[PDB]
Amino acid sequence: AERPTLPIPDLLTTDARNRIQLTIGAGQSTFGGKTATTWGYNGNLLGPAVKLQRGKAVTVDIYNQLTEETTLHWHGLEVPGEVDGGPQGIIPPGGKRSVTLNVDQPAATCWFHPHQHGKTGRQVAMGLAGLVVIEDDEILKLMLPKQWGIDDVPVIVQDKKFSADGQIDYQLDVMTAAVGWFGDTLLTNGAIYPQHAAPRGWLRLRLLNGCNARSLNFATSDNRPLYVIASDGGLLPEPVKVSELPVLMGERFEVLVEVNDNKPFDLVTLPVSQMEMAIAPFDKPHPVMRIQPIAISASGALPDTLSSLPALPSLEGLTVRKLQLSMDPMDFHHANKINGQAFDMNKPMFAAAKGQYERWVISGVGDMMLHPFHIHGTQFRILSENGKPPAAHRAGWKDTVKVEGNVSEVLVKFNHDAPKEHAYMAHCHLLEHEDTGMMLGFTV
Ligand SMILES: [Cu+2]
Ligand SMILES: [Cu+2]
């Protein structure tokens, strides 16, 4: 048995009447010979890549065929509260939901997943995640690698814990609420250590850390560089060459990597400093996927310049908001907090100004856990990350910011409304923390 081929999510576009159908359902997937019940969008596991065009409205019809309630959140999309599919956007079992997305942001890889209050971790663990590929008039002029599933590939990396029966083993209990749900089976687009057939020249990887709790650190088996071309919210001004790429839960980077000879190399994840994430088999470099070159040459290029990043404005005069994350020293369902309160679906913590720059200061000072802090409804600028100026590859458009025993500062603006009944969320994207209170709503 050769390694399995990397599964490629289907590139899903609008039909005749500008509609997209998404069915949330249960099926079966096989993992190392053993069948398991899994959940998928438009299939058994994970989901398709929804492809939107900047400025072209589309309607998404969502059918919930699960045995519990769900929501469908578009992680990274600047859309109104009413289509954002946070915990208020309940779709009951057997239920249907329609949403109009009017995409009004630069080209980027976003994603979608459940946001059910207290169940998100379980619902992502069982298999639900999809991709969103935004294109605009600018990115297509660049001549990047762009053959979907050939030289432009999504890489959804996820660990799972299985019971001896072969079934996914999720439980949100008093330890998971603290440290997060993780396992020793690493999945790459839902496959174990797949291989991807790549043409000579530039391979474009759209990396997503789709793990509940585990952070990742991408490198190559032979330490060839990754050229970072994009972050969560789209293109950097120019490529940032790195030898390793840390990626928090819920973050996307797009990287070019060279396929310059006929020899296979792996994309790996390196050991991380995170409570209990460096236990074997993550105590050494762990293979993510085998890149197998084909003698085909690909025309994609690494442009010396990608885009223009607008100047930071003056920070004098801007509203400051302080967000203190805290974990109850020892009811575990409400142990994690922001500003001393566990998520109340009913009571938004504050109202942001529409179209007005704000500085949000997020503080994990008082514990040493990793909190990838995610704000809905915006692509922001990181001003300070964990008490340093941001790394070059992290200094563009971001929807997540590291908070780990220190203080981060991001420049935020909300171009779209979110009323009380469909508030935006701001939360830790360690899903078990989210599910145990580490989240607020806010209005616009
Ligand atoms: Cu989000
Ligand atoms: Cu957290």
Short mmCIF file of all heavy atoms in Angstrom, two decimals, residues 101-154:
data_model
loop_
_atom_site.label_atom_id
_atom_site.label_comp_id
_atom_site.label_asym_id
_atom_site.label_seq_id
_atom_site.Cartn_x
_atom_site.Cartn_y
_atom_site.Cartn_z
N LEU A 101 -24.71 36.06 1.34
CA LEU A 101 -23.32 36.59 1.52
C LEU A 101 -23.04 37.57 0.38
O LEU A 101 -23.05 37.12 -0.79
CB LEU A 101 -22.30 35.44 1.49
CG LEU A 101 -22.63 34.20 2.30
CD1 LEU A 101 -21.51 33.18 2.21
CD2 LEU A 101 -22.92 34.55 3.75
N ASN A 102 -22.83 38.84 0.71
CA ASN A 102 -22.38 39.91 -0.22
C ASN A 102 -20.89 40.15 0.05
O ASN A 102 -20.59 41.06 0.84
CB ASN A 102 -23.18 41.20 -0.03
CG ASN A 102 -24.68 40.99 0.00
OD1 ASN A 102 -25.26 40.47 -0.96
ND2 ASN A 102 -25.34 41.39 1.07
N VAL A 103 -20.00 39.36 -0.55
CA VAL A 103 -18.52 39.39 -0.32
C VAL A 103 -17.97 40.75 -0.77
O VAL A 103 -18.14 41.09 -1.97
CB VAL A 103 -17.80 38.24 -1.05
CG1 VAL A 103 -16.33 38.18 -0.69
CG2 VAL A 103 -18.46 36.90 -0.79
N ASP A 104 -17.33 41.46 0.17
CA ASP A 104 -16.81 42.84 0.03
C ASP A 104 -15.44 42.94 0.73
O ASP A 104 -15.26 43.86 1.55
CB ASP A 104 -17.84 43.83 0.60
CG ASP A 104 -17.64 45.29 0.18
OD1 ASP A 104 -16.52 45.64 -0.24
OD2 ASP A 104 -18.63 46.07 0.26
N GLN A 105 -14.51 42.04 0.42
CA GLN A 105 -13.16 42.06 1.04
C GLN A 105 -12.16 41.49 0.06
O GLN A 105 -12.54 40.78 -0.88
CB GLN A 105 -13.18 41.27 2.35
CG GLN A 105 -13.44 39.78 2.14
CD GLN A 105 -13.74 39.09 3.45
OE1 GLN A 105 -14.88 38.94 3.85
NE2 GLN A 105 -12.69 38.67 4.14
N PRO A 106 -10.85 41.74 0.26
CA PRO A 106 -9.83 41.20 -0.64
C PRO A 106 -9.81 39.67 -0.70
O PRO A 106 -10.23 38.99 0.25
CB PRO A 106 -8.49 41.71 -0.06
CG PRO A 106 -8.87 42.85 0.89
CD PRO A 106 -10.28 42.54 1.36
N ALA A 107 -9.28 39.15 -1.80
CA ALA A 107 -9.07 37.70 -2.02
C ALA A 107 -8.42 37.10 -0.78
O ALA A 107 -7.48 37.72 -0.21
CB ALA A 107 -8.22 37.46 -3.23
N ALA A 108 -8.85 35.91 -0.39
CA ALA A 108 -8.33 35.22 0.81
C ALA A 108 -8.87 33.80 0.85
O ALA A 108 -9.93 33.54 0.21
CB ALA A 108 -8.74 35.98 2.03
N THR A 109 -8.19 32.93 1.61
CA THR A 109 -8.73 31.61 2.03
C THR A 109 -9.38 31.77 3.39
O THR A 109 -8.67 32.04 4.39
CB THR A 109 -7.66 30.53 2.07
OG1 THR A 109 -7.04 30.65 0.79
CG2 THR A 109 -8.26 29.15 2.28
N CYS A 110 -10.69 31.66 3.44
CA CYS A 110 -11.40 31.60 4.73
C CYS A 110 -11.87 30.15 4.93
O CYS A 110 -11.43 29.23 4.17
CB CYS A 110 -12.47 32.68 4.80
SG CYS A 110 -11.79 34.37 4.63
N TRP A 111 -12.70 29.91 5.93
CA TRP A 111 -13.26 28.56 6.15
C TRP A 111 -14.58 28.69 6.89
O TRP A 111 -15.04 29.85 7.19
CB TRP A 111 -12.26 27.61 6.82
CG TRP A 111 -11.92 27.92 8.25
CD1 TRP A 111 -11.41 29.09 8.74
CD2 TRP A 111 -12.00 27.02 9.36
NE1 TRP A 111 -11.17 28.97 10.09
CE2 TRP A 111 -11.52 27.71 10.50
CE3 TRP A 111 -12.44 25.69 9.52
CZ2 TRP A 111 -11.49 27.12 11.76
CZ3 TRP A 111 -12.41 25.11 10.77
CH2 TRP A 111 -11.91 25.81 11.86
N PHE A 112 -15.25 27.56 7.02
CA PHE A 112 -16.56 27.54 7.69
C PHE A 112 -16.66 26.26 8.50
O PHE A 112 -16.05 25.23 8.18
CB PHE A 112 -17.68 27.75 6.67
CG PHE A 112 -17.91 26.67 5.65
CD1 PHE A 112 -18.87 25.68 5.87
CD2 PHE A 112 -17.31 26.73 4.40
CE1 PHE A 112 -19.13 24.73 4.90
CE2 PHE A 112 -17.57 25.77 3.44
CZ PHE A 112 -18.50 24.78 3.69
N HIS A 113 -17.44 26.36 9.55
CA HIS A 113 -17.53 25.33 10.59
C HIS A 113 -18.70 25.68 11.47
O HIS A 113 -19.21 26.81 11.43
CB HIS A 113 -16.19 25.25 11.32
CG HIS A 113 -15.79 26.50 12.01
ND1 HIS A 113 -16.24 26.80 13.28
CD2 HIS A 113 -14.94 27.49 11.66
CE1 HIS A 113 -15.71 27.94 13.67
NE2 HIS A 113 -14.94 28.41 12.67
N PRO A 114 -19.10 24.71 12.33
CA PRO A 114 -20.15 24.96 13.31
C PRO A 114 -19.75 26.00 14.36
O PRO A 114 -18.56 26.18 14.66
CB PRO A 114 -20.36 23.61 14.02
CG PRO A 114 -19.55 22.58 13.24
CD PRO A 114 -18.59 23.34 12.37
N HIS A 115 -20.76 26.66 14.92
CA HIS A 115 -20.59 27.58 16.08
C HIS A 115 -21.72 27.33 17.09
O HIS A 115 -22.09 28.27 17.80
CB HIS A 115 -20.45 29.04 15.58
CG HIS A 115 -19.33 29.82 16.22
ND1 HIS A 115 -19.14 29.87 17.59
CD2 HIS A 115 -18.38 30.63 15.68
CE1 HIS A 115 -18.09 30.65 17.87
NE2 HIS A 115 -17.62 31.14 16.71
N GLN A 116 -22.20 26.09 17.22
CA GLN A 116 -23.21 25.69 18.25
C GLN A 116 -22.62 25.96 19.64
O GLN A 116 -21.49 25.52 19.89
CB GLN A 116 -23.62 24.22 18.12
CG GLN A 116 -24.68 23.78 19.11
CD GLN A 116 -26.06 24.33 18.83
OE1 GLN A 116 -26.35 24.82 17.73
NE2 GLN A 116 -26.94 24.22 19.82
N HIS A 117 -23.36 26.67 20.49
CA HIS A 117 -22.93 27.06 21.86
C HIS A 117 -22.65 25.79 22.67
O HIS A 117 -23.57 25.01 22.85
CB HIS A 117 -23.99 27.95 22.51
CG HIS A 117 -23.63 28.42 23.88
ND1 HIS A 117 -24.56 28.51 24.89
CD2 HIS A 117 -22.44 28.78 24.40
CE1 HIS A 117 -23.96 28.93 25.99
NE2 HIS A 117 -22.66 29.10 25.71
N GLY A 118 -21.40 25.56 23.09
CA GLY A 118 -21.00 24.41 23.93
C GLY A 118 -20.77 23.11 23.16
O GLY A 118 -20.32 22.14 23.81
N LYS A 119 -21.09 23.05 21.86
CA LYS A 119 -20.98 21.79 21.06
C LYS A 119 -19.98 21.93 19.89
O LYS A 119 -19.64 20.89 19.30
CB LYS A 119 -22.35 21.33 20.57
CG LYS A 119 -23.38 21.05 21.66
CD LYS A 119 -22.92 20.04 22.70
CE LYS A 119 -23.99 19.69 23.72
NZ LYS A 119 -25.14 19.00 23.09
N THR A 120 -19.49 23.14 19.60
CA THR A 120 -18.58 23.46 18.47
C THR A 120 -17.42 22.46 18.41
O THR A 120 -17.17 21.93 17.33
CB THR A 120 -18.07 24.90 18.57
OG1 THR A 120 -19.20 25.76 18.50
CG2 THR A 120 -17.07 25.25 17.48
N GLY A 121 -16.72 22.24 19.54
CA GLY A 121 -15.61 21.28 19.65
C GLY A 121 -16.01 19.89 19.17
O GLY A 121 -15.32 19.31 18.30
N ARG A 122 -17.11 19.38 19.69
CA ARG A 122 -17.63 18.05 19.28
C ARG A 122 -17.98 18.08 17.80
O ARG A 122 -17.70 17.11 17.11
CB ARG A 122 -18.85 17.65 20.11
CG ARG A 122 -19.45 16.32 19.69
CD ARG A 122 -20.20 15.57 20.80
NE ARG A 122 -20.37 14.19 20.36
CZ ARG A 122 -21.34 13.76 19.57
NH1 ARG A 122 -22.29 14.59 19.16
NH2 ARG A 122 -21.38 12.49 19.19
N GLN A 123 -18.61 19.14 17.32
CA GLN A 123 -19.17 19.15 15.95
C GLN A 123 -18.03 19.25 14.92
O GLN A 123 -18.16 18.59 13.84
CB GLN A 123 -20.19 20.26 15.80
CG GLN A 123 -21.40 20.07 16.72
CD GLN A 123 -22.65 20.71 16.16
OE1 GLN A 123 -22.58 21.55 15.27
NE2 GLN A 123 -23.79 20.28 16.67
N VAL A 124 -16.96 19.96 15.27
CA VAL A 124 -15.70 20.06 14.45
C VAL A 124 -14.94 18.74 14.58
O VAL A 124 -14.58 18.12 13.57
CB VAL A 124 -14.88 21.29 14.88
CG1 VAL A 124 -13.51 21.33 14.20
CG2 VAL A 124 -15.64 22.59 14.60
N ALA A 125 -14.85 18.20 15.79
CA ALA A 125 -14.20 16.89 16.00
C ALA A 125 -14.86 15.81 15.14
O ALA A 125 -14.12 14.94 14.61
CB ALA A 125 -14.21 16.56 17.48
N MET A 126 -16.18 15.82 14.98
CA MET A 126 -16.91 14.74 14.25
C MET A 126 -16.73 14.87 12.73
O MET A 126 -16.99 13.87 12.00
CB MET A 126 -18.40 14.76 14.60
CG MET A 126 -18.71 14.20 16.01
SD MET A 126 -18.14 12.50 16.22
CE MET A 126 -19.07 11.65 14.94
N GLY A 127 -16.28 16.03 12.25
CA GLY A 127 -15.81 16.14 10.86
C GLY A 127 -16.19 17.41 10.14
O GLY A 127 -15.75 17.58 9.00
N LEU A 128 -16.98 18.28 10.75
CA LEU A 128 -17.57 19.43 10.03
C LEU A 128 -16.53 20.54 9.91
O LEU A 128 -16.27 21.25 10.90
CB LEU A 128 -18.82 19.92 10.77
CG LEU A 128 -20.04 18.99 10.69
CD1 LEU A 128 -21.24 19.63 11.39
CD2 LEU A 128 -20.37 18.67 9.24
N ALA A 129 -16.01 20.75 8.72
CA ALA A 129 -15.31 22.00 8.39
C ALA A 129 -15.32 22.13 6.89
O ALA A 129 -15.20 21.11 6.20
CB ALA A 129 -13.93 21.99 8.97
N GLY A 130 -15.50 23.35 6.41
CA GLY A 130 -15.37 23.65 4.96
C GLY A 130 -14.41 24.78 4.69
O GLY A 130 -13.87 25.33 5.64
N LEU A 131 -14.18 25.09 3.41
CA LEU A 131 -13.29 26.18 2.97
C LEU A 131 -14.10 27.25 2.23
O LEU A 131 -15.12 26.93 1.60
CB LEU A 131 -12.21 25.61 2.05
CG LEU A 131 -11.10 24.82 2.75
CD1 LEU A 131 -10.13 24.23 1.73
CD2 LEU A 131 -10.32 25.68 3.76
N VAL A 132 -13.60 28.48 2.28
CA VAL A 132 -14.09 29.61 1.45
C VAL A 132 -12.89 30.22 0.74
O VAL A 132 -11.91 30.64 1.44
CB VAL A 132 -14.83 30.66 2.30
CG1 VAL A 132 -15.41 31.75 1.42
CG2 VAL A 132 -15.89 30.02 3.15
N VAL A 133 -12.99 30.29 -0.57
CA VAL A 133 -11.94 30.84 -1.47
C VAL A 133 -12.52 32.11 -2.08
O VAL A 133 -13.49 32.02 -2.89
CB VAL A 133 -11.50 29.84 -2.54
CG1 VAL A 133 -10.60 30.49 -3.60
CG2 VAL A 133 -10.82 28.62 -1.95
N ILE A 134 -12.00 33.25 -1.64
CA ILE A 134 -12.45 34.57 -2.17
C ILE A 134 -11.45 34.99 -3.23
O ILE A 134 -10.25 34.95 -2.97
CB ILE A 134 -12.63 35.62 -1.06
CG1 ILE A 134 -13.48 35.08 0.10
CG2 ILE A 134 -13.20 36.91 -1.66
CD1 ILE A 134 -13.47 35.96 1.33
N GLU A 135 -11.96 35.36 -4.39
CA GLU A 135 -11.15 35.95 -5.47
C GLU A 135 -11.65 37.38 -5.73
O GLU A 135 -12.79 37.69 -5.37
CB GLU A 135 -11.20 35.04 -6.70
CG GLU A 135 -10.63 33.67 -6.40
CD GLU A 135 -10.13 32.89 -7.61
OE1 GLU A 135 -10.73 33.03 -8.71
OE2 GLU A 135 -9.15 32.15 -7.43
N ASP A 136 -10.77 38.20 -6.29
CA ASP A 136 -11.02 39.63 -6.60
C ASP A 136 -10.28 39.92 -7.92
O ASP A 136 -9.68 38.98 -8.47
CB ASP A 136 -10.61 40.50 -5.40
CG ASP A 136 -9.13 40.48 -5.11
OD1 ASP A 136 -8.37 40.06 -6.00
OD2 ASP A 136 -8.73 40.86 -3.98
N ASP A 137 -10.27 41.18 -8.37
CA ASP A 137 -9.72 41.60 -9.69
C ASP A 137 -8.19 41.63 -9.61
O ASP A 137 -7.55 41.47 -10.65
CB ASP A 137 -10.31 42.94 -10.12
CG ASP A 137 -11.81 43.10 -9.86
OD1 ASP A 137 -12.55 42.09 -9.96
OD2 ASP A 137 -12.22 44.23 -9.54
N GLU A 138 -7.63 41.79 -8.41
CA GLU A 138 -6.18 41.98 -8.16
C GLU A 138 -5.45 40.62 -8.20
O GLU A 138 -4.50 40.45 -8.98
CB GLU A 138 -6.04 42.75 -6.84
CG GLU A 138 -4.64 42.74 -6.24
CD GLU A 138 -4.57 43.04 -4.75
OE1 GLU A 138 -5.56 43.58 -4.20
OE2 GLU A 138 -3.52 42.73 -4.14
N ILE A 139 -5.86 39.65 -7.38
CA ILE A 139 -5.08 38.40 -7.18
C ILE A 139 -4.89 37.67 -8.51
O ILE A 139 -3.81 37.11 -8.74
CB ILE A 139 -5.71 37.51 -6.09
CG1 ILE A 139 -4.77 36.36 -5.72
CG2 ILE A 139 -7.08 37.00 -6.55
CD1 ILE A 139 -5.01 35.75 -4.34
N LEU A 140 -5.89 37.66 -9.40
CA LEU A 140 -5.79 36.91 -10.68
C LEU A 140 -4.71 37.54 -11.60
O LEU A 140 -4.05 36.76 -12.31
CB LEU A 140 -7.17 36.82 -11.32
CG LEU A 140 -8.18 35.96 -10.54
CD1 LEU A 140 -9.51 35.86 -11.27
CD2 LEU A 140 -7.61 34.57 -10.27
N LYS A 141 -4.45 38.84 -11.52
CA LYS A 141 -3.38 39.49 -12.34
C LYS A 141 -1.98 38.96 -11.95
O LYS A 141 -1.08 39.08 -12.79
CB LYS A 141 -3.39 41.02 -12.20
CG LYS A 141 -4.56 41.72 -12.88
CD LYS A 141 -4.23 43.10 -13.44
CE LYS A 141 -3.98 44.16 -12.38
NZ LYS A 141 -5.24 44.68 -11.81
N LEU A 142 -1.80 38.38 -10.75
CA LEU A 142 -0.46 38.00 -10.21
C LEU A 142 0.14 36.72 -10.83
O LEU A 142 1.33 36.53 -10.64
CB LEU A 142 -0.55 37.82 -8.69
CG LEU A 142 -0.69 39.11 -7.89
CD1 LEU A 142 -0.72 38.77 -6.41
CD2 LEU A 142 0.44 40.07 -8.17
N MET A 143 -0.61 35.84 -11.48
CA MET A 143 -0.02 34.60 -12.07
C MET A 143 0.55 33.70 -10.97
O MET A 143 1.56 33.05 -11.21
CB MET A 143 1.12 34.92 -13.06
CG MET A 143 0.78 35.99 -14.10
SD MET A 143 -0.85 35.79 -14.87
CE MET A 143 -0.63 34.25 -15.75
N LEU A 144 -0.06 33.67 -9.79
CA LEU A 144 0.23 32.63 -8.77
C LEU A 144 -0.09 31.23 -9.33
O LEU A 144 -0.81 31.11 -10.33
CB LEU A 144 -0.60 32.96 -7.53
CG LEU A 144 -0.13 34.20 -6.78
CD1 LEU A 144 -1.03 34.49 -5.61
CD2 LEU A 144 1.31 34.03 -6.33
N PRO A 145 0.42 30.14 -8.71
CA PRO A 145 -0.12 28.80 -8.99
C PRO A 145 -1.62 28.81 -8.68
O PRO A 145 -1.97 29.34 -7.65
CB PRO A 145 0.67 27.86 -8.06
CG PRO A 145 1.94 28.64 -7.71
CD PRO A 145 1.54 30.10 -7.76
N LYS A 146 -2.46 28.29 -9.57
CA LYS A 146 -3.94 28.46 -9.49
C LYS A 146 -4.74 27.27 -10.03
O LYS A 146 -5.97 27.39 -10.06
CB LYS A 146 -4.36 29.72 -10.26
CG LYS A 146 -4.25 29.61 -11.78
CD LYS A 146 -4.51 30.93 -12.50
CE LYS A 146 -4.19 30.89 -13.98
NZ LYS A 146 -5.25 30.23 -14.78
N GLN A 147 -4.09 26.17 -10.43
CA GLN A 147 -4.76 24.89 -10.79
C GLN A 147 -5.25 24.16 -9.53
O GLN A 147 -4.45 23.51 -8.82
CB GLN A 147 -3.81 24.01 -11.59
CG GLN A 147 -3.29 24.66 -12.87
CD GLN A 147 -2.29 23.77 -13.57
OE1 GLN A 147 -2.66 22.74 -14.14
NE2 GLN A 147 -1.01 24.12 -13.48
N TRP A 148 -6.55 24.25 -9.24
CA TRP A 148 -7.13 23.72 -7.99
C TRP A 148 -6.89 22.21 -7.93
O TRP A 148 -7.24 21.49 -8.87
CB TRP A 148 -8.59 24.10 -7.86
CG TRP A 148 -9.21 23.64 -6.57
CD1 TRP A 148 -9.99 22.54 -6.39
CD2 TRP A 148 -9.10 24.28 -5.29
NE1 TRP A 148 -10.41 22.47 -5.08
CE2 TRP A 148 -9.88 23.51 -4.38
CE3 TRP A 148 -8.47 25.43 -4.83
CZ2 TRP A 148 -10.01 23.87 -3.04
CZ3 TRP A 148 -8.59 25.77 -3.50
CH2 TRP A 148 -9.36 24.99 -2.62
N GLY A 149 -6.22 21.75 -6.87
CA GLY A 149 -5.98 20.32 -6.63
C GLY A 149 -4.76 19.81 -7.35
O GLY A 149 -4.50 18.62 -7.25
N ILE A 150 -4.02 20.67 -8.04
CA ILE A 150 -2.78 20.26 -8.76
C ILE A 150 -1.58 21.06 -8.20
O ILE A 150 -0.70 20.42 -7.55
CB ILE A 150 -3.01 20.37 -10.29
CG1 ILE A 150 -4.02 19.31 -10.77
CG2 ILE A 150 -1.72 20.27 -11.06
CD1 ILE A 150 -4.60 19.59 -12.13
N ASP A 151 -1.51 22.38 -8.44
CA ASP A 151 -0.38 23.23 -7.95
C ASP A 151 -0.90 24.26 -6.95
O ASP A 151 -0.06 25.05 -6.40
CB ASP A 151 0.40 23.85 -9.13
CG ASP A 151 -0.36 24.84 -9.99
OD1 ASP A 151 -1.56 25.07 -9.71
OD2 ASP A 151 0.28 25.44 -10.90
N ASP A 152 -2.21 24.27 -6.73
CA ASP A 152 -2.89 25.13 -5.72
C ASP A 152 -3.76 24.21 -4.86
O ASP A 152 -4.86 23.86 -5.29
CB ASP A 152 -3.67 26.27 -6.38
CG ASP A 152 -4.47 27.08 -5.38
OD1 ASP A 152 -4.16 27.01 -4.16
OD2 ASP A 152 -5.45 27.74 -5.80
N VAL A 153 -3.28 23.79 -3.68
CA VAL A 153 -4.01 22.76 -2.88
C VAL A 153 -4.31 23.25 -1.47
O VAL A 153 -3.49 23.87 -0.76
CB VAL A 153 -3.26 21.42 -2.91
CG1 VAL A 153 -2.46 21.28 -4.19
CG2 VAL A 153 -2.36 21.19 -1.72
N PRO A 154 -5.54 22.96 -1.00
CA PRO A 154 -5.90 23.20 0.39
C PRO A 154 -5.27 22.08 1.21
O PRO A 154 -5.19 20.96 0.71
CB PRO A 154 -7.44 23.14 0.35
CG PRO A 154 -7.72 22.12 -0.73
CD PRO A 154 -6.64 22.34 -1.76
#
